Amino acid sequence: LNIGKKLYEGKTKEVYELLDSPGKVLLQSKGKAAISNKITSCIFQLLQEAGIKTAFTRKCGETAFIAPQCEMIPIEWVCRRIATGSFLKRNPGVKEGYKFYPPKVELFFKDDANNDPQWSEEQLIAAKFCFAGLLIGQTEVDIMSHATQAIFEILEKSWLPQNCTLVDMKIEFGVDVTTKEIVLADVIDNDSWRLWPSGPEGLQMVKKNFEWVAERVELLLKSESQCRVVVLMGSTSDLGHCEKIKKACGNFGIPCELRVTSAHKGPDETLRIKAEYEGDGIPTVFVAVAGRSNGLGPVMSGNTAYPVISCPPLTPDWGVQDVWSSLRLPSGLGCSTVLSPEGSAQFAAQIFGLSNHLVWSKLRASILNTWISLKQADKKIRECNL
Amino acid sequence: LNIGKKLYEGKTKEVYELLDSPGKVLLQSKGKAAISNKITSCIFQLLQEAGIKTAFTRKCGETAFIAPQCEMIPIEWVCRRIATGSFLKRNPGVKEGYKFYPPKVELFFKDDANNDPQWSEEQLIAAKFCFAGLLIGQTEVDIMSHATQAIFEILEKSWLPQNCTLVDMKIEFGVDVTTKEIVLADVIDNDSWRLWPSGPEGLQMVKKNFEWVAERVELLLKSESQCRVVVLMGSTSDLGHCEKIKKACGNFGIPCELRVTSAHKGPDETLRIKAEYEGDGIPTVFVAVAGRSNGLGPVMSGNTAYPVISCPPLTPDWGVQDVWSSLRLPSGLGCSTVLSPEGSAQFAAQIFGLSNHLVWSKLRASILNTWISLKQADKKIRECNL
């Protein structure tokens, strides 16, 4: 049903304990506060589906949402693509509009409504903070800045179709008391970011009002770009190879179908099947899987205007001899080769990602998370250099 | 004889024109100013011999030195390895002693004895400065910061043998009016850097006084570590290959000798020659050059405690078959392989560099300069994307 104790809170919400369910044992509650919760519930669900570790479970009512319990980091991370207001005042000379390409990440010391300054990434490390048991140093500070930039880009991309420019945003992290992971732990409403109208060009430039932002955010959870990956295999004995591609495609939310066809045996049939994927208007990418001399990829590519990846099921036995039938093609063939089965699915994702922000986001989160993972393995092996 | 007009000047020297010799048409003149000139004359000659582009020609008298004429950049570049004084005051929290590893580079706006603030690398670009025709932007600002760090490390290394720790330094650049290159254009005396005694440990930590620094700086121009590269070739028909290595070694100031010996023909003789390089105490690195089945490298490595590089003179005719005789050696052989002739000389340099700061410096300057070159080619091809 619902319970609750006391606990902490921020400026927009009040965090409460939740007996009858420990861990995610947290409830955020807080006119227009219901708008602020609708926004923060989408951005979170969005960033979460993309792959970003974020403190959010399910939406709750109109002005609430439960999320895992965690100790907050007293720092305000801000990311910019364009310099405006405050920044200008702090950085004399930078004319408004200056675009930052990496883009710029700055963090502000303790949120304290007093002066709450700007800390150097080095003053945070020397701060030697520790929450939920996690001592915050190089590794952790590096994760948050990287994750902030990643979260920025994801939202920046997600907004573009609504014709909105993410100028800059503010975000706070927190260590999950259970998993001990640094997570995007606190609400993101219309005062967490700044969205130009981007159809330097419009009025004096006015951030979208929480009202307009409100009735658009749910649209970021869906994409206009449809996409499909069709896997063609010359022989069912490679079914396993094709399934790794299919499963991989599943990780990037891209629908994928497996099919059996032989350029060598049923030339005519291969073209036929090609036609029914071409004629139905769904943007498609073909992945050709043919062992030995691969004539499947070459033929497909030569008869379709869509991309064609040859992903040969090589084994070290004769692999070195077979790949060349996939590389070395007669002129006029765009056909590309990718040896890794999941790798080919990833490439396909990156192809569709150019049009589907939801896919792009998953690629981006993944890039980040892989870095997070690298970072941790090094710290774990570093322990053993004593 | 000598002439001169008016021109500009800094805080320690007064730059004068020099009729009878345009371009390098500059003279720096300025008790203890003679000390300041002796110091700045070595550091310059040092950085110059290492490969750093620096505004310095020859020393002149006791309190002067001529250098090429150039327009100065109104910025003070500072590099730190350890945080102290000023920095601490500017960065609250960073306890004294904090080591910066990249290490830290900061630049201060216009030298103006007024407030002469701290500029962001982005405020300098937006400053849109232009000297001697060179508009200063991304590329140029990036060169100076990189060059500053490189110059730091070189001097940091150069000092170590005198048991001195380079804590931080200040440096100013300038565009050479002739070549148009950004060069380390202005004096480096004892007020340009800070040298601990490094034998947190000594007194309250006192920078060396210009007197002690003075009678040590000339020692940085020489090294304690002797080094020699001996090139063994199984056949004089590879003489050309060996000479590229020799010439390359010449670029890193390492003496190199070529010799003829055959593991297959004169086994006994090869060992003999090996012995006369081992017995004379000069730290040596052996580079084995043997075509076809290379038994020279393998044998050398197995009979000497010094390093042995196999640098096969491969050609695409049978290269793919020959390299394996240099790779794939029976156990107990440290023998390493390096295909590029100059590349093998470079590796040898990096080996000796671990002990000869003069060599290390040349390696470092080279790393930098290659980056400078990459940077410029991209900017030159970028022009053609209009």
Coordinates of C-alpha atoms in Angstrom, one line a residue, chain B residues 16 27 84 92 216 219 231 257 294 336 352:
Chain B
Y16 CA 67.3 46.3 -29.1
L27 CA 70.0 42.1 -28.5
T84 CA 52.6 25.8 -3.5
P92 CA 41.3 26.1 -1.6
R216 CA 75.0 24.5 -11.6
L219 CA 76.1 21.1 -15.6
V231 CA 75.4 -2.1 -35.3
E257 CA 79.5 2.2 -34.9
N294 CA 68.8 -14.2 -38.8
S336 CA 63.7 -7.7 -29.4
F352 CA 69.7 5.2 -23.1

